[PDB]
Structure 1
């Protein structure tokens, strides 16, 4: 079905680096770099307007905001399904099963089946070749974030992109129980 097709498209590329333009609405315009290594490893690094890093090492999700001198740690397992980055990085049958999916060609639109709703909609344009040309998510507050591919490069990424150590002078909020 559409869910198995979507999963197959994302599985075509096991590791990648892709830059995206971001537009947030309901309103900011930004840019960032996305690194993914399957399974579970990712780094979303915003450069504009202000700078931030969201990094998964497969166990811990770190959010680093240098502008507020803060870094937050959560268990990755407690975050799954909260961002489009999570969805793309995991690409698990378990995740896609929670949405009703409509497909036409490379376009997929996903609407929540049931009721713990952190994401009200997710969309993605991804080729059979695994190139992610576009994606978007609508949150519970109806805020939409849309991402347009600038460049994607598939293959070996430096493993260091999936590491994080809280730097000196940075305030850590470690929420891992």
Structure 2
């Protein structure tokens, strides 16, 4: 019913272009180049080559107090409850909740520019520009070295979640523990249509 307007047609095009390119995370190509000064006269020709490695997605893994987990490979968000042996898969794009963890882990200008952000020293307070009720509020404390010390989040139904972080070990961890395969026996609700 609501027609496809120019702004959406452009968004759909950006999105398809992106999904195509998402399929190749690295490649090598030979090319032929041809330059033109402005008028049309052939300024230059030649052969060359190009290597590209695209960014990886962000990854995260959180263990709740109840010992159930949330795992993200950047596409899927997996939720797993080892006590009841139940697992839920959902595309991250359609995921709901856990936005602080997504913001924390992605650290992208473009996610940050969706908020009004005041800064007092190491403390930052973020109010959403688009007040649709995704996150009513988000607060975070980050050292100069980038260590996150604490943060809190207000959901749209005024549900507040606060976190105080300790024992912050930097240094890498193996990508295999950010990819989740339901263990034998676990009921899977795969909501990825």
The answer for the alignment partner of 1:32 in structure 2 is 48
- CA contact under 8 A between 1:9 and 1:127: conserved in structure 2? no
CA deviations over 1:77-128 (Å, ceiling 9, x no partner)? 3338742111101111121111111101110011111133221111100012
Residues 15 and 49 (structure 1 numbering): CA distance in 2 closer, same or farther, change over 3 Å?
farther
Residues 155 and 97 (structure 1 numbering): CA distance in 2 closer, same or farther, change over 3 Å?
same
- CA contact under 8 A between 2:103 and 2:111: conserved in structure 1? yes
TM-score by length of 2: 0.65
Over 4 Å off, 4+ runs:
1-48
Between Structure 1 and Structure 2, which shows a larger proportion of strand residues? Answer: 1
Corresponding position: 1:10 with 2:21: yes
Distance in structure 1 (CA, Å) of the matches to 2:46 and 2:163? 9
Residues 176 and 85 (structure 1 numbering): CA distance in 2 closer, same or farther, change over 3 Å?
same
- CA contact under 8 A between 1:7 and 1:93: conserved in structure 2? no
Deviation at residue 74 of structure 1 after TM alignment? 1.1
- CA contact under 8 A between 1:100 and 1:110: conserved in structure 2? yes
Higher relative contact order (CA 8 A, sep 6+): 1
Deviation at residue 23 of structure 1 after TM alignment? 61
Structure (1 or 2) with the larger CA radius of gyration: 2
Distance in structure 1 (CA, Å) of the matches to 2:99 and 2:62? 14
Residues 74 and 124 (structure 1 numbering): CA distance in 2 closer, same or farther, change over 3 Å?
same
TM-score by length of 1: 0.70
Q: Using the TM superposition, name which of 11-20 and 23-32 deviates more.
A: 23-32
Q: Using the TM superposition, name which of 41-50 and 85-94 deviates more.
A: 41-50
Provide structure 2 residue ranges, at least 5 long, that are not aligned to the other structure: 1-11, 38-42
Q: Using the TM superposition, name which of 14-23 and 130-139 deviates more.
A: 14-23
Provide structure 1 residue ranges, at least 5 long, that are not aligned to the other structure: none
